[PDB]
Amino acid sequence: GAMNSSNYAELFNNDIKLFVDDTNVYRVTVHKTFEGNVATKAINGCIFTLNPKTGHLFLKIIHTSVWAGQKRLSQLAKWKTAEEVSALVRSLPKEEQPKQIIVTRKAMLDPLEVHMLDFPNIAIRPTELRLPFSAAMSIDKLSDVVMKATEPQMVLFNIYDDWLDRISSYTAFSRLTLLLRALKTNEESAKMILLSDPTITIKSYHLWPSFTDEQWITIESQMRDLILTEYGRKYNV
Amino acid sequence: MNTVPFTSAPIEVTIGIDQYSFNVKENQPFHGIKDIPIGHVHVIHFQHADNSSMRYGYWFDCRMGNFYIQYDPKDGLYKMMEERDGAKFENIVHNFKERQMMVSYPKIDEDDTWYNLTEFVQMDKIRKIVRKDENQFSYVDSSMTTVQENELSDPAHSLNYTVINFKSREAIRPGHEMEDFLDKSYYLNTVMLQGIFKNSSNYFGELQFAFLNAMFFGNYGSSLQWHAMIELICSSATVPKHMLDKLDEILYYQIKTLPEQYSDILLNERVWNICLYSSFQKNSLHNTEKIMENKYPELL
Numbered sequence: 254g255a256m257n258s259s260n261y262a263e264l265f266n267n268d269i270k271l272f273v274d275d276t277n278v279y280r281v282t283v284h285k286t287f288e289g290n291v292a293t294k295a296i297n298g299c300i301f302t303l304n305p306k307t308g309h310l311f312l313k314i315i316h317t318s319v320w321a322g323q324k325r326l327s328q329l330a331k332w333k334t335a336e337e338v339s340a341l342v343r344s345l346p347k348e349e350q351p352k353q354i355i356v357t358r359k360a361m362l363d364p365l366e367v368h369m370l371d372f373p374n375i376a377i378r379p380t381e382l383r384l385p386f387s388a389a390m391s392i393d394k395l396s397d398v399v400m401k402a403t404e405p406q407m408v409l410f411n412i413y414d415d416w417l418d419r420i421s422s423y424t425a426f427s428r429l430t431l432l433l434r435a436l437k438t439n440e441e442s443a444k445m446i447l448l449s450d451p452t453i454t455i456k457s458y459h460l461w462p463s464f465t466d467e468q469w470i471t472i473e474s475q476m477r478d479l480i481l482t483e484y485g486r487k488y489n490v
Numbered sequence: 491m492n493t494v495p496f497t498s499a500p501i502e503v504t505i506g507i508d509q510y511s512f513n514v515k516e517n518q519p520f521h522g523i524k525d526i527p528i529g530h531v532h533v534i535h536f537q538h539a540d541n542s543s544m545r546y547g548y549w550f551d552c553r554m555g556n557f558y559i560q561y562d563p564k565d566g567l568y569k570m571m572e573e574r575d576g577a578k579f580e581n582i583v584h585n586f587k588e589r590q591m592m593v594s595y596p597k598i599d600e601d602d603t604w605y606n607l608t609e610f611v612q613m614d615k616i617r618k619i620v621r622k623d624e625n626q627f628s629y630v631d632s633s634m635t636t637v638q639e640n641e642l643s644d645p646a647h648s649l650n651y652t653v654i655n656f657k658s659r660e661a662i663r664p665g666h667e668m669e670d671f672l673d674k675s676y677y678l679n680t681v682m683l684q685g686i687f688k689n690s691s692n693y694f695g696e697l698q699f700a701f702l703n704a705m706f707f708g709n710y711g712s713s714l715q716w717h718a719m720i721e722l723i724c725s726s727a728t729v730p731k732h733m734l735d736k737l738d739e740i741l742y743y744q745i746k747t748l749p750e751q752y753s754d755i756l757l758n759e760r761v762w763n764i765c766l767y768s769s770f771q772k773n774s775l776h777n778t779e780k781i782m783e784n785k786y787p788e789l790l
């Protein structure tokens with residue numbers, strides 16, 4: 254059934270599972286027309302498909318051409334997501350295929366279930382958690398590859414960099430969701446915290462800066478402070 | 491005109507015949523129901539005064555044989571039984587219809603309700619949903635589950651309705667996932683009508699029979715089946731025009747006949763609101779929409 258605070262440790266057991274987030278698949282800018290009406294212009298998007306145990310990210314870039322001449326795009330986007338997720342599963346070796354797929358929005362359940370009928374033994378699960386994966390496009394290297402794409406493309410990342418050499422998956426996911434929650438609540442301040450010092454470098458093959466253990470504790474504290482504040486600045490407390 | 495003769499009435503019981511019903515007292519002198527119209531299937535059904543658990547009954551057609559009821563004190567129910575003989579079925583009733591204690595199948599001559607509820611229902615199809623081939627009539631009760639229910643436990647006692655499942659490979663063509671899930675026309679017209687049912691009359695027959703089992707016996711799996719067969723039509727963008735017109739009539743008379751106090755359990759809010767207001771055929775069920783709104787505006 255649904256995933257929530259009570260069964261949180263299941264994410265890090267040894268059953269392969271993937272989170273699928275569709276919030277950045279269909280992306281538009283809204284603008285006025287010469288005649289003073291409103292129109293949308295699509296921009297490139299992405300499916301965020303993540304193994305929370307290993308950090309492996311399957312970033313399927315959604316090129317704007319996929320919407321050309323199509324109607325009801327927000328509905329199509331969910332089915333396109335499910336089509337691509339199912340294609341990814343079929344492309345993986347059997348021993349790499351997930352035993353569960355957890356969708357971050359409940360509207361993905363029926364489209365994914367229908368596209369995965371061929372996989373009766375893969376459980377499609379919602380979650381009650383309010384995960385911050387929409388903020389993936391606040392990670393500069395991910396945003397950069399999505400916007401530069403000129404055709405559909407799959408790009409593979411490890412969203413944890415090398416962190417698993419030193420910390421557990423539980424701790425790595427907690428750090429990731431903290432960073433992404435911060436980026437979502439106040440991107441500019443989150444990014445100042447991470448990137449205010451250009452000598453803490455991001456390795457060419459990484460997404461985040463090469464913080465020592467001690468610098469990660471300071472960083473994480475600063476992100477908590479940001480989230481608590483924004484929550485005041487918002488509700489005035 | 492034909493008659494269903496009763497050996498006796500040893501236990502107090504409410505007896506239904508089609509949409510009619512009457513109370514019989516313990517050991518009341520009662521030998522049957524006469525004037526039963528030829529040309530339609532019928533159902534005769536029972537609810538004991540002591541145990542309202544288990545409404546049960548028998549679908550039958552008078553053209554298929556001479557049928558009577560006798561109570562079994564071991565199994566504790568009124569049984570429909572078959573007696574082939576004009577030297578017995580005639581020799582016994584000819585005595586019973588000189589002593590007048592039956593009520594008329596009480597059909598008002600203006601009334602086409604029963605025809606309208608059973609237009610497409612045919613005993614030969616009932617006997618395939620209710621498998622018991624040694625009898626010409628078919629027993630149903632409140633508790634019998636459907637094939638589809640048992641997949642999700644005694645098969646001999648199942649209702650073998652046609653399995654409909656909108657999230658199944660039968661329903662969804664590979665490569666047409668989104669198309670086929672949002673427009674079920676493929677599944678209705680190609681899979682179900684052309685493939686399984688062969689024609690719309692057989693489809694409507696099973697739909698009508700499911701409704702009647704839901705109404706007369708409170709059979710929950712039947713109600714599920716009735717709503718599934720409605721929803722498959724309403725969720726198809728492409729339905730023959732004659733089917734839509736006929737479905738509107740079918741549903742109108744089912745809604746007309748439903749007991750007003752049973753709408754809470756027999757009617758599925760989601761299916762009806764989707765069918766009448768959101769679906770492809772939202773504008774194609776005028777008679778059904780009008781009666782639903784004037785009679786059950788709460789559900790909507």
Ligand SMILES: CO/N=C1/CCS(=O)(=O)c2ccc(F)cc21
Pocket residue numbers: 495496497558559572573578579582583
């Ligand atoms: C006393 O009636 N006994 C019986 C059983 C034998 S029968 O089959 O001829 C029969 C037929 C009709 C009936 F209403 C009753 C009976």
